[PDB]
Symmetry: C2
Subunit: 383 residues, 2 copies
């Protein structure tokens, strides 16, 4: 029996800034971000939108009444939490109207959290084939105006329905995970912004893929030629390409050309969004499913999940026959094309705004599931 991703969708805020405009405002070459880090449009969100906002919208796009009765576990992977004790998943459980006899919790481990959720959800369903699990990656990647990380920013969420007989991707039992205590990226309690060791982040990501790929190759004998496509967690596109290039150098020219073309297809959506942290790898999966025209049922997709901190995992999924009829291509393109482009002034004003949770107030925002009020630090969501 198969178990995997039955439905998957992503949500990004209704705003973005063009990277040419950002480069101009930052007094650097207009094309520096397009050809350097490989990013074109950056998702931006106002203080009236948080991980619950994104998670609720992403999940709403895929849940039916039947799903809500069958789901008995809700997992949110994030490193952008809004509470140190109460899981964002509990609020998501309420907003989605999922049946009450369910377990809900938040998983945290850099940009790896949602992957942990997907694997545990898979086990759960393997053991209870009649039950389903909702796993959502939700995060807001902010580094600060005029900062080094600024151009790699992003915000959004990716929701996944895990179930038996999945209609999209059947997960294999070939997982290879790795844990190494490295301070490449972290965020001490109470730091609104992350601590980043640039050189170490770059090195650890590249070497993480190599380590996990090598061990996986040893255990399975599967090589690049056995993979129809690869989805990567990426802080920005150039990074995944560098990690990939460093490992496929001994492959034939045709194979290298094939692997890099799939990679380009996997980052089509990412170039218009930015870093989603826990949701980046999965945004790449979605891009591959809706944009890669040569993929077909039976193909093998390798997924490299990276988590700063650091924890990494390589695993495989097989495309299910008929999967092309269960995607959200139109909803997704609409979501991206319908965003309001911000001027750099409008963007900086929105980014600098801060939510003081200690102040009782009301917030106005048309987006469904956005913060409507704060009372004694408690958030209300408009739905």
């Amino acid at each position: 029996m198969t178990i995997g991703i039955d439905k998957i969708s992503f949500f990004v805020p209704p705003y973005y800034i063009d990277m040419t405009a950002l480069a101009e405002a930052r007094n650097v070459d207009p094309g520096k971000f397009h050809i350097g880090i490989g990013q074109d449009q950056m998702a931006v969100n106002p203080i009236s939108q948080d991980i619950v906002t994104f998670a609720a919208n992403a999940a709403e796009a895929i849940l039916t009444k039947e799903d809500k009765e069958a789901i008995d576990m809700v997992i949110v992977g994030t490193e952008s939490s809004i509470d140190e004790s109460k899981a964002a998943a509990v609020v998501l459980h309420r907003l989605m109207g999922i049946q009450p006899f369910a377990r809900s919790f938040e998983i945290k481990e850099g940009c790896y959290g949602a992957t942990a959720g997907l694997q545990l959800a898979k086990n759960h369903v393997a053991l209870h084939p009649d039950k389903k699990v909702l796993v959502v990656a939700a995060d807001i990647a902010k580094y600060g105006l005029n900062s080094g990380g600024e151009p790699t920013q992003g915000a959004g969420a990716v929701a996944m329905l895990v179930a038996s007989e999945p209609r999209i991707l059947a997960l294999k039992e070939d997982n290879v995970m790795l844990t190494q205590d490295i301070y490449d990226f972290w965020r001490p309690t109470g730091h609104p912004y992350p601590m980043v060791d640039g050189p170490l982040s770059n090195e650890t990501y590249i070497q993480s893929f190599a380590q996990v790929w090598d061990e996986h190759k040893k255990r399975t004998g599967l090589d690049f030629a056995d993979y129809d496509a690869l989805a990567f967690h990426i802080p920005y596109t150039k990074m995944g390409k560098k990690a990939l290039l460093a490992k496929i150098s001994d492959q034939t020219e045709a194979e290298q050309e094939r692997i890099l073309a799939r990679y380009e297809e996997s980052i089509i959506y990412s170039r218009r969004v930015g870093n989603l942290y826990t949701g980046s790898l999965y945004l790449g999966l979605i891009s591959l499913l809706e944009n890669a025209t040569t993929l077909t049922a039976g193909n093998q997709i390798g997924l490299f999940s990276y988590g700063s901190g650091a924890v990494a995992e390589f695993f495989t999924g097989e495309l299910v026959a008929g999967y092309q009829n269960h995607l959200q291509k139109e909803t997704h393109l609409a979501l991206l094309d319908n965003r309001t482009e911000l001027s750099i002034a409008e963007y900086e004003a929105m980014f600098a705004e801060t939510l003081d949770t200690d102040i009782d107030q009301t917030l106005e925002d048309e987006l469904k599931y956005s913060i409507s009020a704060i009372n004694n630090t408690v958030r209300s969501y408009r739905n």
Copy 2:
């Protein structure tokens, strides 16, 4: 194949304060603490000790060389995290010398996080019987000096080794879970102390037990008579007694006597520690195992896990033949009996001290795994 807890141990700081002393310092009748909430000694820790310190000491008590090679998943359940991104499980993985190819992450959902870890660990070992999972509840419950919650404070960790063919507790597939969005206890990002609605917390806890118990009885036909003992998560010992008393009101006055005396055995260690959040339920399980003389192999143990926020789960475990040979009573007694009693003045000085992680410094503390230094916000541990 049976699956469950193979080994278990708890760890608390080497300091405590007498509840009589606290009551006198707070101008309250000592009986309001000893009898009212049912607490006698409160675990207290200095800033040189965090959840890593406690998790590392607890896990080390139960890990052999072979365990460290067979463990491919490290989970830390906590609501006292020290990083918003990097999981505490990653540091624990390093300090424990576990083999590198493991996945490590943190689970957050009030005081329910460890339970979620245990259940997912169970599923993992059920599917991969040759592998083991390290699950650690680790927390520091501080409310504030002269606060309403002050007398219910505690600190420590409970490490569990999950494996197939467990030597202590074989878990049953009878889990009943519940999720409700309730603001009984929470902690907004940036709040050192919890936000608490005492009466809502009190009522939600009592009602949550009733709901999962009733639902469990409906699904299994099992009642109180079929349970040889019960372990409860507890913010303080009278709370569980209150929840229990409300649900056994219609049992024979002899059942009631048996259930209540068994409950008394489950809180012996807890009265000397205080609330451990994720670890409270599991400290009660250890107490039952190590203090309940008439329990034997084959006996059925009911566990009620509560998580503020709120989530709950009732599940069953069976005592494995020979379990009495795989406990850590001597170690635990020494830990509790060897602690240094603090005067209220030493307690307040120790309690109020803050750790400015933004300052590079060196720290002194004899305890193994205590914080030895802070460099660029990064913590180093004494080993």
